[model samples]
Target: GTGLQEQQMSRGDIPIIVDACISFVTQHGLRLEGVYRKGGARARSLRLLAEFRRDARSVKLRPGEHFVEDVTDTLKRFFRELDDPVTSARLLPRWREAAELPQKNQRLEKYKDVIGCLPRVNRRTLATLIGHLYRVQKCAALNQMCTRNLALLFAPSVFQTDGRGEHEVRVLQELIDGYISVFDIDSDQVAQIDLAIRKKLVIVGDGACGKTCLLIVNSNYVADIEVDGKQVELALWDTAGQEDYDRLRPLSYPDTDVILMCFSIDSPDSLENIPEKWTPEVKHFCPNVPIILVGNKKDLRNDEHTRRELAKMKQEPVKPEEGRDMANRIGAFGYMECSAKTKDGVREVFEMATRAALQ
Candidate 1:
């Protein structure tokens, strides 16, 4: 009996059905329109699944011989037929809980740990399955199988439950969206998967609030980063602070994945604008996008001249607590303090943005 948990499941290899279907698809269907979205002949799909369950290794899948949909359906059926979901039922709660984490960094770390807890087969199978999905989404432009689209198709099978909820969707989305960090994915002999994933970060603040410095790191910066080179590029969309430019600023808000709300630590007035002016405007333009509250110009926080200047008006540099306090009020995902001048916490600013965006 080829039961799931009975034999010593090997880590280096995967189930034959999973392997066969994926290999066939990668070879033939990667560019096919509606690859996973369409169903194959049910009769053939069931027959294929039965054959794999009967003797997995004996299966031979070739392009002309096997319709891609039947192969993919059979693959989906294999996981559904499992005594437990590939993630394993015992750890399914952990998977959902991790997916539910409000903070992206914490959520991702929790996902990594929970995924680490899977039985050897489940672990490798998840890694491999998700890895394949990464490539699937990489060629998204051609296949129309973007992250959420792929998640919708596979979540029920992956979770072994109704796929109608955000928790499971988020779990699969994050797994593919953040493939590099969630999994410790660098193996020397095989090397890494190559592709770039694009994400947008729109930084906004008062004119003197110094949000531009947050990404000073670019001029509407398009950055190339190294996360399997897949979806690693970040496009920084800088907003003009002049009141007259308000009409045109909303143009930049479209297609934004994350928002970095910045303020100068030395100017409390700028911080006030976050809730009073910026938040209201941003909410109108992009409501669902995650926001990170950033305090820039930290190098001036302790500068005697800046301190005296603010003190003259009975004000002081915005404290970390203030930043945290405002972040909470605005329901921001992260509250970070950085100084572009010193390059302190600058990387962390975008790092959190990336996590928030991917999540």
Candidate 2:
């Protein structure tokens, strides 16, 4: 009697699992035509029945092999019950009314008992019961049933407002202010600090090869750069490299002391575009600014071996070798290969930029 009850199936069972299963089946109901067993003497009997429950959680089973028969028998009963329109009709309104309540807590508490008294299609009932949490707040009883469901119920999607237009930007500023408020510093100190930091840096690169990563790394490193024995705060902007944004590139160049250009050693197109578009265009904006070149994804090439030590890039794959050639032609102030994924040479890239900018 206490076989699976006491032994406890490794899969584990929820306390309301059975009730949820029954409620689902009862709501939608089922239709069973007949039952048959093919094997004789040694063969165990099996049943096939039609089930109408739409939800999946309404099916229930014990750990043992016998539950398969139980499931099939339950399905047949489910279909057979569907034939009685009067009985099913009476229950249909209750299920619909239960689903429509403003708060799910009332429906759960109200249906708690009726669910236990019926032969539920476990698959459908389980889904319905689980969905009730979305409507109920502080559902500690249901929380333990599925931690993931509980997480989704209380997860902070408050800032996930859509179609709010310009108001959304104001919300973002409020959030930023709220974040800084936690540090016990007032708006004046924050504004003073923000204004002192000069937002100046030029990051030029082909689309999406860790250009943003390099800028971010440098910004964190140079939050306070030494200028005249005192630390001066500097703001670094990771400029977009899209063609449409190229016009804005010149505006930032006047304020920038250092121009950092990156190209993928693996992509020839990125290698060639640096000189064709970046250098000439950038020189026209800030000809005096120092230029730094980085050959990213270097570690992927012969595992961090020195550029001179490795075999020359081949002619057929014109991309990687072309980047190396371009770096040399510009008399690039500093050159090194780095992998963003491995973080190799990442620190060196920032250090090189800082040294060049200071000079």
Candidate 3:
């Protein structure tokens, strides 16, 4: 009967039910961790709720209800019996008030003591944390982040530190201090913070095409580049393009700000794989994300050994014009060539990636 009832329900109702469940969890401040622990009525109910959400399309429900009645009833009872409630409505105003207060000035002073524990060599990481936190805070404010999302944003700074080493403690202190400074700032500084955007650049191409080497070379050199007179951090993610990784590669596609679709200048087949494989995968996962076509291993393009290897296959090295034409065919933002071996044009590849991300 329950299965029959679920089949009678509209598929569109699933999202509505999911939203209500999420709202219930958020309002009650019920830790998801608790749901995974040993036996308790609330824990069992929460586990059921999670499983239902995870497989909502297949889960059966009673016909008359828009959501699972058992889960909703359990959540309501759990919240009602709670000794204290920490709903968003009750805490959001307090958070906003704290943001408006200048108490962060004193907190920043205390943070200096924490930073003092680190060697001078590690102090620069503190500055990087400030920049990163400023960007995060600006985005959170713009989006009016929910309590859960806000907690997730600060989880690294809040939960992920052990004061076992001087460097470890330095990073922990810096992260805490940075977030405090971010929230304490006035509206005028918010605009400045917005200028420090962190962009993700995921590189994809055939393995051994020098994609990983190019990513490493560019990342080391492209720190704190100024694009459009605003500071930008181009976080480089190198993805494997081999057939074995076909199932695992898409995991790196989400939240990618831009893509560097690379191929080796010495391998025409690698260039062929771009439109045949790489471009399709990238477009499937991130259709609107800009792609910067990169031709790596340029140093080998003119090398005697490289030419001989290609000659045996009745092919020549991929020409610069060929790369440019392919970029145009794929609607790529730009085309650039680099040799990771000699570090030539490597910086330009990332610079172009950062520029494309800003656009």
Candidate 4:
């Protein structure tokens, strides 16, 4: 009994060093025989067993070792504790620590108390001190490059292209009016609101249809709009449209009051996927929120008949007569079309989404 109690209570350098070494070897499959030189003497067979069973895959020991006997006995006790889920959960942290290496070098410095114990010079860890400064210098260089490029060639603009500029302009107008009341305001109000509400606005759209460029035009429209009294901040998060991250759809949607679901006018498949693909999951996560639909790249359509025919090919083709059919199905309050690159109908998309959210 005394021997068992001693095993339980022992916290001396010998036991600690053994336990630490055991933890490292068990967690990482590292052999400390050469690195520590005094491996077998420092860690007895029993202590190694205690650590090895923490993550059983890595343990190896010869039969008849003294620690192995202790390991067999301790494991019997561990099994009893594991039967109760609460007990198992409570012991999991201890088990994890027993399998992990002691934090040496700068690992422990991440914790607040450990950081305070170090000297002034050593207080700033290698990562926290010089590493951050190096990153800052790199960023400064990039900023200089951008400044030069903007000054020499063209103003630094987002979402630039000739393919669908007109449709984008309409969406920009919608977005500005949707979010804020800028119709009656003068230039001063626009400037004031521009400075006031700089919150981030995230717009999610599928790839190759101009979501990023559309957001740029929308941002500039926000910049140009004049509002009075109430100033709202706006920022935009534009996600890449690629199949590689189709799995990340749930994580990609913003946790916000409003969203605009978009597809290209030329892509019926994109429209078909809207309800089954995006809306249900988004609504599950954020049930009482507003969403708007946008059909972009309208310039690709030569006439009203062509646009209608293309929209008809959509799974639930959204025609003027269908009258917000897609929006109603997906619980989105509004829908519209615009081109981002041409700045056409871009403003309306924003306004529509904002109005739905406010309502």
Candidate 5:
């Protein structure tokens, strides 16, 4: 009976000893072997466990002492008891079981729409904003808080893209307006409200090769187009290809969904730069992005002045077949010709870019 009672007592004491050892190890960030080394004569298996229990129990804990559980619970309680109106408002749904509340749902959708319209370039910032808002939704707060106020509160942290709060607000307003007008919340077509698609397109080519002109012409016709019945926003980024900008060019290559490699048809040298310079650079930076080989300035291809100028250097206008051959050589998505001067085939250039982004 004595042995049985002692065994039961030792078993009950196990938790206290284990808890003490855990507390000591975590408080000092020590390894298990370190604990054994520090225990000296009391470092043996059962003796070590007993020593830990004795030491932990010997220290009288004050009211709400600083154990890991205590510290964590205190932080949670601090947030739970917050009476700041803005904080309360931001965290309203979190302090209660009210995810189904209509107002809360509406507010969440509004924020989501705002987040959705943001450019793909701000992916990391967007992710941080999303995580912050998700946590905020779980807290208790006032019900009358507006989206603008929330944006202002998070401006310094989440919306500090260009250090201009007013610009951020303006962009937010534009997004809110576009989202509200384009999305029909009352109809079945609104199912796509949660689906936001934005793609990054980087244009690269030799200097003075009509790359900028192509981007300018395409940017003016920015429209919401449906891809596989889903709306997509195409963002065109024009990159400087001069030797002076070579070091800085790769900065814009990150997160690129598609690449447009342009060469002026009137300049055969520009076409030659594709395999020599542009293809290798793009492949290095964005290995998997689809490349669309674009022959620009097609209107000038057969012009008398263009022929005269190129013939002076023993060069001729790059033919359509040549562009197609280069595209195949570089494993491009496809080859296309466009005249930014007359806006001919420009729409098709971007349309193909959008398709590549979807791929």
Candidate 6:
């Protein structure tokens, strides 16, 4: 018997690494793009598994040289390497059959009933894993790592084998998608868990500023970038054009970790709106969150068509220096420019926000 259980006795119900890995992932990996899908630095992860095997309790998790993908992959490896599957080898087929039930309601009922028959440790371990999945999928809008993606990547690890076909996948999906009922997470518990993921990023500006397109086409997608050799998962929130500023309310955004103040490089009025309309409102609600000044439609700054179009109004594109001046005036962490139409410099805009978020 390895210290997997021996260590479990000392740390609580689950194995120490399970707790450690889950805690670290929730803290650092929640925003990682394709969080659990990538294998990460396989060499390091393999070394990490060896370290855990040799003595996980003493293993240190510093992310700089280590990628979140590595940590995430390591977590999956531990479960896959289990001497006995958390659902038990023989009982997996039963779990699979349960997922095949005709109706959603009945499937969860059977899945729940079937799970009750597991040994105590198996139940606790599986519950812990399910809980992690629930939390990970809840932020699907930001990370793009939805329940199906998670279920697909995680099923084999949970079952401790491959080739069970897709039956094993369904059980995972239900456990995550129907998690509240199946896993017994009540409303209050959900509240606590949601607030626990407070990596909130709220962007505000007029629709004309290209705010709509800046964070559009994707559901609050979070990107993984290497910052200081550490992976930083930046969550972006943007709702666009025509009616954003008037409809926005401070109360709607609470516990925000970062703020993005947007303006258009082609329109000077949008820049004027920054201090006049946006800054005060965000300062009122998210008093301490870092605010990034973003200039969109950078590609239009030099366009002859845009210049001629604005010439009708006797206006030119907003210059980079002017954006920087505004950044200083508003005490913004930084100013950046991008073109959603070209996807040019879009990465840097979010990267700057990511820097402000954690700095």
Best by TM-score: 6
Query: Model 2: runs farther than 4 Å from truth?
Result: 1-199, 217-234, 302-324
TM-score of each: 0.51, 0.38, 0.45, 0.39, 0.45, 0.53
Could you give candidate 3's per-residue lDDT for residues 35-144 as a string of tens digits? 20111223334556555545544544432232222343333332222232212223323333333435656544555554454433223333333443334334444334
lDDT measured at residue 118 in model 3 versus the true structure, 0 to 100: 44
Q: All models: lDDT?
A: 0.77, 0.44, 0.56, 0.42, 0.55, 0.73
After superposition, the stretches of candidate 1 with alpha carbons farther than 4 Å from their true spots are 1-3, 6-11, 187-192, 195-359
Taking the candidates one at a time, how many backbone clashes does each contain? 6, 20, 0, 51, 10, 3
Question: What tens digits encode model 1's per-residue C-alpha lDDT throughout 86-136?
Answer: 877788779878877788889989999998888777777888789889888
Residue 354 local lDDT, model 1: 85
Q: Model 6 over residues 1-359: C-alpha lDDT tens digits?
A: 44235544325577777877888888877876557754443344677777777776887676554556557777887777677777788787788789778999999999888888887777777888888988998898877788987887787778755434478788888888887788787889889988812256778875346665777632356655665566765566654322212343544467678888888887775786688767887888888788989998899999997787456545689999999999999999999888999988787877777777778
Per-residue lDDT for 348 in model 5?
A: 90
lDDT tens digits, residue span 1-359, model 4: 21111222114322222233333433322211111111121123345545644543444443332232233223322322222321123333432333243533222222223224433322222112122222222233432322222111111011121222332233222222222221233567546534344433446655455677778778713433323343444445565443223345555455666676776665554565566555665677557777777887777656565466344323223343232677677777787888786788987877665555445
Tens-place lDDT per residue, model 5, 1-359, is: 11111211122242232233333334432211111111111112223333333443453323223222222222122222223311123332332222232563454454555444444323222342232232222221422223454343333323322223354443333223334332323445335322279888889996567887788776613445575677788767777654334666888899999999998897675687788779999999999899999999999988998788557546689999999999999999999999999999998988888888897
Residue 6 shift from truth in candidate 6, angstroms:
5.5
Q: After superposition, how far is residue 267 of candidate 6 from its true place, in Å?
A: 37
RMSD of each: 22.1, 23.6, 20.8, 24.9, 25.5, 19.5
lDDT of 4: 0.42
Candidate 3 structure lDDT? 0.56
Clashes of 2: 20
Q: lDDT at 37 for candidate 3?
A: 13
Displacement of residue 209 (Cα, Å) in model 2 is: 2.0
